[PDB]
Amino acid sequence: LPPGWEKRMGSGKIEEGKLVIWINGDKGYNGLAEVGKKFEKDTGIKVTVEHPDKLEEKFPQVAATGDGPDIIFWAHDRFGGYAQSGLLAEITPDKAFQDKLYPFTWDAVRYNGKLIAYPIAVEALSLIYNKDLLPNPPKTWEEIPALDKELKAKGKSALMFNLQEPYFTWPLIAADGGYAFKYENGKYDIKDVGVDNAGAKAGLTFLVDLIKNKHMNADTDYSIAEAAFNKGETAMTINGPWAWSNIDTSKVNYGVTVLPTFKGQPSKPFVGVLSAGINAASPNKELAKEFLENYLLTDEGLEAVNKDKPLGAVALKSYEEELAKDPRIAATMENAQKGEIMPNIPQMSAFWYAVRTAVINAASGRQTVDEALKDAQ
Ligand SMILES: OC[C@H]1O[C@H](O[C@H]2[C@H](O)[C@@H](O)[C@@H](O)O[C@@H]2CO)[C@H](O)[C@@H](O)[C@@H]1O
């Protein structure tokens, strides 16, 4: 199980009197660092924002040995698993603080009756399109192939998104009836990975058909997708609010809109709530609580992070109402509403690993759409 246990053995594990915060590379870590500086000026407490690669997997490795950051940022879906491993301190906001956030966001970070993290923003994938190449985006997945060959004559592609992470292809898979775990009447039934049904099958086959007919390459990743769109080579892409910042600086005239339908049914992106949890091994819990409640989760705090990279629909009511006017955010919520909030059950990491492989192989010439979808059942 453990990696890197030997190195840190005698090094003072999590430093006292300091704050170490981890957050994914695609998020506004400089904006967060600004809140840190505001925190440093008021308290003398030094804040250090880092963005390690493979964050979602590096944290459970180091935290299991009493290591890592005081504060861990990630979508809520992996927090129940962190909680079951005893990596998270329980958080104690009072009622007056909880009322400042949307109740549905606290539910996303509630595991076994306990609040295990602070909600920050609601994330959902949307269709992002180049208006100069495509003033009106297609409403259906089915009209993409015809659109793509049309654009091919001009040396442009129709659609390019990250095919390595199942997060980006999940809304296709779930549009017709695919699902992770049955949620019947309050609690999830793990004994039916609904990733096997016809609805799921029909979704991935189309993606596989899109690569069979050369409309998409199966080796396309986040960096390749972002580059093709931001330079102006592809007309559409699929991404979250965090990506808007790099697109903004590329001067592609872009719009953010509802994901394409499939079989007359909307794509259902897996909705993620960006959350901040406190390491169980942190000797700075009160400092972390003070930082999170009175510095980050304020209008000034969220604005700083947002200006760097858009968080989407923030969990804090007061700062939200100022953002709702942004149609890109409206589009995010529209897609979120058509999708479903990810569960936080510990099985999710297992789910994600399976589907990921189940998607890569089926999209490639290594396994079929069943030697991958049964391989993940
Ligand atoms: O691809 C599986 C992956 O999906 C989600 O990860 C998202 C994350 O929520 C977003 O904030 C953004 O960083 O894109 C990620 C996909 O690369 C799940 O949250 C994650 O647990 C899961 O592994």
Residue numbers in the entry: 4 to 380
What text comes from the article?
In this study, we prepared WWX, where the X-residue N-terminal WW domain fragments is denoted using the format WWX. WW11, WW17, and WW19 take an alpha-helical conformation. In order to assess the crystal packing effect, three independent structures of WW11 in two crystal forms were compared. In addition, the WW11 in Form II can be superimposed onto that in chain A of Form I with an RMSD of 1.65 Å. This indicates that there is little or no packing effect for the structures of the WW domain fragments. The predicted structures of WW11, WW15 and WW35 are nearly identical to the crystal structures. Therefore, the helical conformations in the crystals are not artifacts.
